[PDB]
Structure formats: structure tokens, C-alpha cells
Symmetry: D2
């Protein structure tokens, strides 16, 4: 069945001003590409093609100019705005008619993932046609996120949002898969102590016992881009991987062509406008080179 | 006699595409603040308050949104567009009416400077009220820049642009001081074989007239640019190591304007409030009570 | 059956002098621990307990003081020297009587690995009781390594050592698994144009059609520490992972305790001498915390 | 009148264990060269040629292997051990016969300095032939250091060691100049509550006598230390960005000795050969033909 994807690329507030005064976080580069390329590549990796990008009233035309209607990468892109940063769950209100009758999946515009068999870890998430699937990852600072609590035997029992006293060190990453049940669950939500919390959306699935909570192991890197210090670290992290390997991370053109969403000829047409820099040359090398 | 400044912050073309497809280079951060804060701070260190910012038609409003007219920082900022990226020396045809009969200074919107007595090094560039004054810095890769050539005694004898076999390793920094002759030198230049009004031709004109002062910017200075993705990241790591070590900032324009006495403590306090939550407003607040030597 | 491990921690020559004038590369720290901890942790991860450390005549007592007889981490450590840097295959001459009759495995002292299911990728290597198993990894600069060549259909056909003209971009990592056949193959080896080449040891297995060449995917990081620039990159790479996660990479004490090679009580005894710094505090946290 | 120098490069204890279980801190690299090259270079910048190096009994031979007696670099190096790590001011009881009736200078073997006119800033510290001279640098974390306190006019009025509530953000750098009184001040000190002969007591003695010169090391200077794993890595990224930008090196002792004229071109050429293969020997070779300002 049909599964659609949202990228919530909204306002980081004033938290990183003045770095973000001119233009929103998710259009900043992480090393060699816009930050958005990374969650865009995430959805593409779970095999999602029809995608809704949400952002500030101001930055939406810029995400638009950046991406187009997607048709160039064998994707289908539709855009929507969020008036005020009133919580991540608000993505499910804004995208209701986009979501329609289908299965959905929400990724944060400022979250990076990297690792082996990542395709498969998402592939097994996208496959469950019922309930919701989220990921837990061990971190040093669990307070900054939705913390998940497991019982003596591996089962999820509590989910607290930014708790002052973490129970475990297990944070909920910014990737989520939901069934047809999500939108309605989101309509019945009340503001928190003042946002529509993604964690309530998840605990509503936990109480109905339909939150599947799979561990994303220490062999995976989950980076968020929350501080100037960490945004820097993620640029160094990508830079080291890409220069070591001669291969890119979250290059969508490559992700499309590999999922066979565009033929060798279309990819080449995408290589043309960027032939002079290394980014194009990279796409061009993808026509002749075998990469396992 | 007063000096005006020009920041060139136009189109870097397609070189750093796709990072720069959505916004222009000079809005990307270097650590905790927009890249343009760094050359804007450089002009301020030179005591210059009237600055023209030249960018693309497409990005000009985003610069306006970030920097305004300068009144917040005791400056006056004007804006101009460069529709076609036809080379650096063109900032002088676009900036003509801005410049008038005044002295000027050009800065690249994508160069950072750091180090000791940087202020005094700019003051003596700014005090020479006739001719041009540029700066020479030893680099690894002078192939990429305007290269200077010195005789046995340290007089500059030639300037070449991007030679394959540079005569020295001394590159011309993206900082230039000019008298009133610069506009007329720029109006008379013919397009490079490329079709770019090259600033090295402008400086070369002044050199032929014995009016080019070339001062050495020591290896004790950091002159970084951000010409590649790797070097942008390198420049971010650099500032963060200085700021995290020191609890002082590099190229905080509120602090510098305060330190020039272009704004007072009351105005600084007002500038801090809408940012009191983050480290930056907290940093502007702390400047009010602390003596920093 | 019994499988033993070598760590070849010998001379990098004069390549990184003066940084390495005082003491050999593999005792330099990568971020928070000696470089050797990393290949040591690699062998431990393929379930290897009996290990031979080879190094310069000069640095052997220092590797010794660093590690002891291993008995503290439930390992069994024996030491051996290499007079001159006359090739990596020389490890199989020096360690003959150590190797004895058993299965073996050689890792380079200056190679870092990181990734998900790394235990398993080694577990499937250590398991094949016949022939040799090596890994290929895509890289930008294949010239610096043994390059492997694959045919139109995924099979390894040539192995060239530092070729001037790489065929593929696939380099041989510094992890190798060999059967009882290795030692003898190494005795019959002649010096190259002037070293005993590890690649000849491997091509000898390729000609007998007994080199198993498994792709280590782009989801894995293989770092070597060959330039001052790269040694730096690997320190930043570890630092980012460890500070993000609150978990260490290649902490042997943790690898032992998890493989149950030491009981909660012994680990605690190891936590004592380092209680004041973060490294001990980390071991101490391992007694009470559940890490999936 | 001549000045001797002392580098303290002893046991950092167990703090950076396990990185430092096999070798002492001051042998670890900062980028492309051993950490001790950096303070050794600092002494050389001060014009000091006779250096005592104080390390553990265990590591002393490895320093000897790396640095020798100095003759290669126009210096004379001697060695001494500190069996027990009893604090910095103890370098003066151990170094007594080395010091004699001469002036001295202490440097921490784990501090880096960079920036413009660093040489001249050391010269004026070295020219004051009476009293002590230290340096104050604004930091984020003065809790960790000896903190200076200034009155309204910039005279130093107190010194505190690791206060929980520092009076300023000005920390005392690990660089100190002393006259002949320092040994006698050190012999009379009583163990800190910890049991460490604290250098801040030594400097405090001189302050009480109106003989402490405290000079500001500007924010245009980088004074980095390597007190944590993260900051060691940060200091490596820092040097590499300067050296990779410039094609010049920071704290290359062959270059500095050559530049002081402590060795000549023939001697430099000899020092380059056993390293002609790597970038370092290539860098020593290139110093023979290039003019660097
Ligand atoms: C979007 C974050 C995860 C990217 S990743 O799967 O770990 N990764 C390194 C990666 C991978 N693995 N691949 C290979 C791949 C291509 C298509 C489907 C699955 C895997 C890419 O073409 N681009 C990539 O960035
Ligand atoms: C970005 C322009 C060069 C920066 S700098 O002169 O080296 N520097 C560290 C600096 C300094 N020195 N100062 C202090 C200062 C401010 C105004 C006039 C002289 C000195 C600042 O307020 N901000 C600064 O960024
Ligand atoms: C030795 C390089 C590979 C280390 S790793 O397997 O990727 N890794 C991150 C790691 C892992 N995965 N683990 C968990 C683990 C412990 C024991 C057996 C398998 C896996 C650790 O205890 N320490 C580690 O460093
Ligand atoms: C590590 C001591 C401080 C280094 S420094 O004075 O800022 N500096 C960059 C430096 C400089 N300036 N020089 C040039 C120089 C050498 C000798 C005397 C004056 C200047 C060097 O040869 N090596 C150096 O590391
Ligand atoms: Cl894992
Ligand atoms: Cl200088
Ligand atoms: Cl993979
Ligand atoms: Cl300064």
C-alpha cells in the first residue's frame, strides 16, 4: 500500500540567531549540500516518493526553488506552511489532505542518519502496515529529547518529553512511521504546558499498545544539528566519510538512480548543469562506475 | 577626510552548488554568525561607518533583513545589486555615486581576518590618504590569487593574477584601500580574457604610478577564506576554538561598534534583549559590566 | 576450533617524523585511548582471545607495560618483535610457533573500524574454517592499498599492490583471516621489487581460488591513520561519536565484559584505578546500565 | 646578562589515562610535531638557548632521544627528573644548579602560543632584568587557573589559584620570567593544602614586593592548552589550519633556530637530509632558498 512522507522543516526559533536570522536552519549547508537533502534522502531510503515539505511562510518559496516538484528526481513534491512553531504534531494537521487515506511518515528537517543496512532498518519499519514505528538511540544528554523507558526485559513502558530526570539514556530519533490512525490522534490533542507534542502522538500509540520501539544501535550515527558546536561536528563527520570513500552521503540524485526512479539518461541530464564542480563530476562518475 | 567601504557579496556562481543553491555564500554561517559579519567587522576595525553592500538582486533583501540600515550598530548601510557577476573591479562602477569624491575601501564578503593589533594594521592602511594600499600574506597555494613579487630589498615590482608559476608565495588579501583615482582606473579597464574587470589590473595601474603600498600581513595573522567546502568548515572550527577558549567573540559587530564608541551602553542593552535567551545576547549583556583589555 | 590473532604494530618508517620520532604510531592516542586499543578491540570483536602483538625491538616493552599478559581483560597476550620493516607478511614468519596448528587472523595496528553489526561481519569471517577472508571497501585513493578487481558479476579476479593505475576503487582493509595454510605460503615468499607483501599471501589464496572477498559497505567507516591530516580526522571522528552517545568505541574492558570474558566483579576492579577520570567512571556506569 | 629556561614536562598523573599510559603527555603530537616542540620554540622566541627539561625518570630517555643536547639546533639542552609530581614551583629546587646566579624562565611543556609579534612580546618580558614577569589572558574558564585581579586603572592587585568565584576572567599563562630571587622564594614555600609547591604562591611573593609585572596577552594571541582530550584535538585542528593555509610552520624549531641565526644554511641543509622524503625535511629544504617576511 501507499506510504507518504512529511519533512518538518520549520522554525528553530531564535535559538541559533544570528546564524539563522537570514534563512532557516534546514537550508544551511551540512558540508556540501543543504541540510534538507539529508531527511529528504532518509525518506527516499525508506522507498517514499510522494513527499510534503513544511516550513515557515517566508522560506517555502526557497525550499521550492531548491527542489521543484521533484519530478526531476522521480519524486512528487508538494509544499505546505506552518504559521507558528506550535509543535511538531502540527505537521499532521497541516498535511491532512496530503496524507489523505494513506500510510505516512514524518522526519525532522534537521536530523542526520548514517549507517550500514540503513535501507533495511527503514524497510522493516515501512513494511508494518499497522500502528507506528519509532527508534531509540543511546545518547549522553537524554533530557533534550523524548526519552523512552524499557522494562527489565526489553519492552517500552514510558515516554517522557524533555524530562528533568531521565529514566534511561534512550532518546527518540526524529523519524516516525504512522498508519491511517495518526491524523485523528493529532486532532484530539491539546496544547502542552505551548506546543502540540510529537510525544503525545507516540504515547497515544503506546497506551493502545501499538508503538513499535526498535533500538537503533550504537553502530549508527544519529546526528542532530541543535547547537553551533554540533552543526559543526556534523559537517566534519560528513566531510571525513566522503573524502575517505570517494562517495557521497545523502546525494538524492544517487539515491533516485539506485532505487531506479530515474534512468541513466535522466541522471546524465542532471549531471550537465553541475559539470564543472565536483558534485556533478560525481553524478557523471555514477554512470560508469559499479558501487556495491 | 573620511573613507567609505564596499563589501562585495555577490554570486559565487555554481562552484559551491548545491550548498549555495538556496542562499548566497555570504549568508552561510562561520560558526555562530553569518559570514558577512566578518568582513563587515573588518571595515569597522578600519573605522569605516558608511558601507555599501553589493549582492545579487535575489539575495539583497535577505542582507537587508539581517543588517538593516546600520543604525542599530552606529553605521549607515546602503545596498546595491550586481545583476551579472562580471568581476571584482566592477564594484567601482556600481558604487560610483556611493563613493563620490571620498576615499574608499573594498572588502571581499567571504574573507575572515584575525590577530593581534589588527586594528592598528588597518589604521596605517587607512591613514595613507593617497594611492592604494593592499596586503600580502604567505600562502600554500598562491596559484589561486593575485601574487606580488618583491626585489632583494622588499619593494613590490610586479603583480600577477593566478600565475601557474608564481614568483613568490605572497598572495594579495581581499582587502583594499583606494584614493579618488580608483573609479577612473575602473571605468577604463577592459574585460579580462575571461570577461572580468580584474582587481589586479586596478592595483597594477597604481603600481605603475608608484602609488601602490604593499604591506606584509604577518604569519602571526590568520587570513582565511572559504573558497571550498573544506575550507568553510575549517574556518568554522577556527573561530569556535578561539571563542570557546576565550569567552570572547571574533567579529561580533555589536561589541566592536560599542568599542569604537559608535553606540553606548544603553543602545547595547537594547540590542541584547531580543537575544537574551541565547549565548549571543548573553554575550552582549556581559560586555556592559566587564572590562576587556 | 581455535583461532588466534596477530596485531602487526610495527614501524611506519620515517613517514610521520618528527611526530613519531619519540614513540611508534600505535601508542599515539586516537582521541582518548592508545591507537592499539582499536585493532585489539577488533580481534576481541571477532571473538579472539589469544593474541600476539608484534612491534619494534624498542617499543615492545611499552606495549607490554600498557597491556600486560591480558589476563586482566580475560585475554591471553604474548609479545614478539620485528627487527626490520620487511613487509607485513613477515608477521606470519615471526608468529609461526605462536600460530602453531591453529586458525589465525592478522590486523594492522593503525587501522580503525566502525559500524553496525560489525561483530556479525567478523563472526561470519571467523566461522569459515577453510581458506582466507578479506574485506573490500570503496575509497577515493585506491593507489595507496592493495586494490581488488571484480568481474562483470561480482567476483574477484585480480589483486594489485599499490598499482599506479587502479582498476577499481576497492581497497583491501587491514583485517585478514587465514586458515592453517598461511604460514607455509609465507615461507615460500620472495621479496618484492623490498618487502614480504601481504598481497602475495592473498593472491596465493586467489589463484587456489580460496580468497573470500566480502564487500564492507559504505555504511561502515574504515579509517587508517596514514597522514597527520587523517590521524586528526580519526580523532575527530571518534570524539563526535563518543560525545553524541555517552558510549565508548573500542574500550576493551567493555568488549571483554560484554563477551562475558570477565565478570561484573573483575570489571569493577578495573574501574578502581581510573575512578577519578571519565574513563573509569565509564566502566563503573557499565555495572548498572543496560546498553542494547 | 643571560637568561636560562626550564620546561616542565613531567607526569600529568592519571587524568588522561589511558591515552597517556604508554608515553608522557609532552611527547604526544599536536598535528605534525611533538607537543614539546611548542614550548621549546617559545623559549627560543625569547632568545633563550640553555634549556633544562624536567620530566619523569621513565620518560627522560625518550626526550633525550628526540631532542639530544641541542647542538643540532644551536642550543644546549640538559635533563633532570622529577620522581614525584609535587607541583610546578618545585622546578626551582630541581633546577637550582642549572640556574646558578642567572635569570630564568619557566614554560609549561603542554602550552602552545601563537600570533603576531609574539617575539617582541617575549623580548620585553625578557628585558626586565629584575622581578618576575607573567602574562594574563582572558579565558572562558578561569576557575581552572591562577587568576589576576586588576584595579580601575589596570594595576594587578591580587592573584588567586583556582578560585570558585574568580574576580576576573584573566588567567595566568604557563609562561614565567624570574630574576635570581626565585630559587629562594621556592625553597621557602610550604605545601599547598594539596601538598603542591604552587607557582601562584611564588608569583604572589613577587606581587607583595611590588616586583610583579603582569602584561596582557591580547585576544589577538592564541594561547591554547591541551588539558583535555577534546582540547588536544582542538589544538591539532588549529595548527593544521594555520600550516595548511600558509605553507609555513608553527613552532618548527629548525626554522626558528635558523631565523635567530643560531644555525646557518649549511647546518640547516644537514638537518633536512634525514627527512628529505617527508614534508618536514622538504619544508626545511625550502627555507634555504625562500625569503619569508
Ligand atoms: C539518508 C541517511 C542514510 C544514508 S546511507 O544509507 O547510510 N548511505 C551512506 C547511503 C547509501 N547506503 N547509499 C546506497 C544505497 C542506495 C540506494 C538504496 C540503499 C542504499 C546511497 O546511495 N547513499 C547513501 O547516502
Ligand atoms: C574580524 C576583524 C578582526 C578581528 S580582531 O581585531 O583580530 N579581534 C579579535 C577583535 C578585537 N580585537 N576586538 C577588540 C577591539 C574592538 C575594537 C577596536 C579594537 C579592538 C573586538 O572587539 N572584536 C574582534 O573581533
Ligand atoms: C573495534 C571496532 C568496532 C567497534 S563497534 O563494534 O562498531 N562498536 C561501536 C562497538 C560495539 N558495537 N560494542 C557492542 C558490542 C559489544 C560486544 C560484542 C558486540 C558488540 C561495544 O561494546 N564496543 C564498540 O566499540
Ligand atoms: C611557538 C612560538 C610562537 C610561534 S609565532 O611567533 O607566533 N610564529 C608563528 C612563528 C614565527 N613568527 N616565526 C618567524 C620568526 C622566527 C624567529 C624570530 C621571529 C620570527 C617562526 O619562525 N616560527 C613561528 O612559529
Ligand atoms: Cl549496532
Ligand atoms: Cl607576524
Ligand atoms: Cl552499507
Ligand atoms: Cl590583541
Amino acid at each position: 500500500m501507499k506510504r507518504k512522507g512529511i519533512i518538518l522543516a520549520g522554525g528553530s526559533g531564535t535559538r541559533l540567531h544570528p546564524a539563522t536570522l537570514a534563512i532557516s536552519k534546514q537550508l544551511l549547508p551540512v558540508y556540501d549540500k543543504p541540510m534538507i537533502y539529508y531527511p529528504l534522502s532518509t525518506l527516499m531510503l525508506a522507498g517514499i516518493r510522494e513527499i510534503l515539505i513544511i516550513s515557515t511562510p517566508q522560506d517555502t518559496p526557497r525550499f521550492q526553488q531548491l527542489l521543484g516538484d521533484g519530478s526531476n528526481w522521480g519524486l512528487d513534491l508538494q509544499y505546505a506552511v506552518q504559521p507558528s512553531p506550535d509543535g511538531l504534531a502540527q505537521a499532521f494537521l497541516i498535511g491532512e489532505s496530503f496524507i489523505g487515506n494513506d500510510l505516512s511518515a514524518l522526519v525532522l528537517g534537521d536530523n542526520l542518519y548514517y549507517g550500514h543496512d540503513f535501507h533495511e532498518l527503514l524497510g522493516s519499519a515501512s513494511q508494518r502496515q499497522t500502528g507506528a514505528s519509532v527508534f531509540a538511540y543511546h545518547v549522553l544528554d537524554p533530557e533534550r529529547y523524548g526519552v523512552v523507558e524499557f522494562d527489565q526485559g526489553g519492552k517500552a513502558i514510558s515516554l517522557e518529553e524533555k524530562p528533568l530526570e531521565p529514566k534511561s539514556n534512550y532518546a527518540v530519533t526524529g523519524l516516525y512511521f504512522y498508519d491511517q490512525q495518526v491524523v485523528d490522534i493529532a486532532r484530539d490533542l491539546k496544547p502542552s504546558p505551548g506546543e502540540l507534542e510529537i510525544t503525545d502522538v507516540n504515547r497515544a500509540y503506546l497506551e493502545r499498545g501499538q508503538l513499535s520501539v526498535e533500538i537503533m544501535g550504537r553502530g549508527y550515527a544519529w546526528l542532530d544539528t541543535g547547537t553551533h558546536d554540533s552543526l559543526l561536528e556534523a559537517g566534519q563527520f560528513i566531510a571525513t566519510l566522503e573524502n575517505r570513500q570517494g562517495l557521497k552521503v545523502a546525494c538524492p540524485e544517487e539515491i533516485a538512480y539506485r532505487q531506479k526512479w530515474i534512468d541513466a539518461a535522466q541522471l546524465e541530464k542532471l549531471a550537465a548543469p553541475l559539470a564543472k564542480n565536483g558534485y556533478g563530476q560525481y553524478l557523471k562518475r555514477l554512470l560508469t562506475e559499479t558501487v556495491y
